């Protein structure tokens, strides 16, 4: 169980750690988070009390180094930094645990939510979507645009999600226009799965990462990507049965965790009604359909 220690908390901020959040007051004795479960990626994220705009945060994996958080008064944000020195880091953390100046990652033993939301998400794939090779952790915020969004402006601050476009030559074989448009299985299985993602776990990992960035940062391009990757599976008549069962589980836990007061902007009415009631897979998402009907019958 690892630790993301903070050097201090100079500005009042709401701090998220995965699906949990804590309020920290200005200059409150706050020295970070302990007992972070090993074996999953994690995200630590921030909303300043004085700018409810720009949520931002850092994706990380404690197996990949000794990360701390230090406030930068010039750039005005809490920054993630790696502590090379395992023993500067160790004696410091040691102190802070002794003074009980760390909050405990508040996992309920029975609770598999975070695993369920991050099952296929790997740090190495995050770092390919979020290109910043000098760090082992990846920064995301509310305003970052996607590569696709940028084709329709700073390339270094982009989310390099795989571009999905249903009215594209990549999506449509010459001479199969109607076939490939109305049944996207070619695009899903040959172009995307076999060709670009290599396997369904990588596909699901990007889908899960896009959802989490939409939920935690309100990142609009991420929400677009999550919906596109759902729609591509649902609009395919031929999908491995194992992917369909896993997708239902994936979506179920995303819909379960979504904040109720965000469903209006996080859920695309057209995609969800098409996927649940019109598409080839309208009868393959039983758990997702049931939680959607009992929680957001308004959208449908």
């Amino acid at each position: 169980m690892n630790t993301v220690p903070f050097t201090s908390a100079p500005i009042e901020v709401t701090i998220g750690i995965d699906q949990y959040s804590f309020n920290v007051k200005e200059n409150q004795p706050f020295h970070g988070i302990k007992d972070i479960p090993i074996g999953h990626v994690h995200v630590i994220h921030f909303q300043h009390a004085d700018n409810s705009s720009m949520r931002y945060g850092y994706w990380f994996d404690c197996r990949m180094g000794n990360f701390y958080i230090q406030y930068d008064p010039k750039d005005g944000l809490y920054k993630m930094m790696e502590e090379r020195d395992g023993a500067k880091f160790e004696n410091i953390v040691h102190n802070f645990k002794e003074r009980q100046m760390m909050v405990s990652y508040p996992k309920i033993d029975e609770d598999d939510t975070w695993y369920n939301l991050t099952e296929f998400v790997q740090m190495d794939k995050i770092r390919k979507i979020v290109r910043k090779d000098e760090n082992q952790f990846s920064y995301v915020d509310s305003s970052m645009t996607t590569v696709q969004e940028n084709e329709l402006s700073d390339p270094a601050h982009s989310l390099n999600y795989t571009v999905i476009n249903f009215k594209s030559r990549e999506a449509i074989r010459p001479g199969h226009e109607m076939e490939d448009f109305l049944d996207k299985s070619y695009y899903l299985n040959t172009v995307m799965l076999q060709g670009i993602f290599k396997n369904s776990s990588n596909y699901f990992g990007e889908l899960q990462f896009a959802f989490l960035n939409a939920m935690f940062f309100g990142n609009y391009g991420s929400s677009l990507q999550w919906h596109a990757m759902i729609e591509l599976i649902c609009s395919s008549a031929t999908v491995p049965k194992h992917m369909l069962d896993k997708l239902d589980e994936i979506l179920y836990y995303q819909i379960k965790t979504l904040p109720e007061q965000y469903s209006d902007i996080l859920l695309n009415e057209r995609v969800w009604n098409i996927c649940l009631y019109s598409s080839f897979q309208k009868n393959s998402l039983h758990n997702t359909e049931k939680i959607m009907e009992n929680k957001y019958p308004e959208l449908l």
Binding site: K167, S168, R169, I172, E177, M178, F181
Partner: protein, 237 residues
Amino acid sequence: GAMNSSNYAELFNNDIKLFVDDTNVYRVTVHKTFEGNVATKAINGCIFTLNPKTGHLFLKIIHTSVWAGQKRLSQLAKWKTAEEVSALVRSLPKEEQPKQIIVTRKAMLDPLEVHMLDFPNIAIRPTELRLPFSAAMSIDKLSDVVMKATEPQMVLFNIYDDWLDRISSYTAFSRLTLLLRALKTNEESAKMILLSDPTITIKSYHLWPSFTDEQWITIESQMRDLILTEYGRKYNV
């Protein structure tokens, strides 16, 4: 963007454009079966592809064999329309290809856009206008060539006859839409107006009677009256 009355003169500028109407592509009669159920029987249709600046009509005849053994024909018809429009564009020399294709029905947008991916510089546009091109099959010579076709066939016409020798495209398109609107709203009366005098002839290479300028004024007034009468009848006004 969508084509409407605000940008209507754009049809007669020097950017080559085509209207595509798919209303008459998939045509059926509905009848009872021996067992008392209902069945459809297809008859030949056509794609109506019209250059409104020049009058050139590319009438692609859709023979009923196209539908043999196919399911969801109303949906297939839109894709067949898109396939044939794209094939037409590919057959034209580059300097003859349209810069815009305006579809009369919004459901034609995605099929055409997909079939036209190889032509990124051709815009595909809907329209808010309620254009009466469905009534093309009330023009006798067009209906006749569609029904007599025994195989797929493209037939070329100028839907304006020789009018452009004397009037502008804008005026010719207004005259065409008036005639078509009238034929749509009351085919019998409209054809009576055009056809009441058999000594006014139609030239072998024309679709419409050879009205003098002053007879056209009379005819156009009669078509206006027809359309307004029908309008009051529909809405008890």
